[PDB]
């Protein structure tokens, strides 16, 4: 969807082309959802070793 967003700004979307492109803000918070899927997994495989 960033590949969607970058290509469509290269289209200059039909009348809404911004001089922004300031991403998110919850999409930056969506990036923290990935590491909180990773920090959840490192402790539950830590219980798996024993």
């Amino acid at each position: 969807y960033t590949q969607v967003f970058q290509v469509t700004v290269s289209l200059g979307p039909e009348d809404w082309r911004p001089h922004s492109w300031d991403y998110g803000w919850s999409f930056c918070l969506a990036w923290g959802s990935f590491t909180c899927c990773m920090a959840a997994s490192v402790t539950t495989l830590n219980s798996y070793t024993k």
Binding site: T2, Q3, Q6, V7
Partner: peptide, 29 residues
């Protein structure tokens, strides 16, 4: 960024290989 996102498919396609070789080892278990 556009040259770098098509190469994610060989990453995730390898990630699908990570379980299929592992799950048959559970059949080896």
């Amino acid at each position: 960024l556009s040259n770098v996102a098509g190469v994610f498919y060989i990453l995730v396609g390898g990630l699908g290989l990570a379980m299929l070789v592992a799950l048959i080892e559970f059949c080896y278990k």
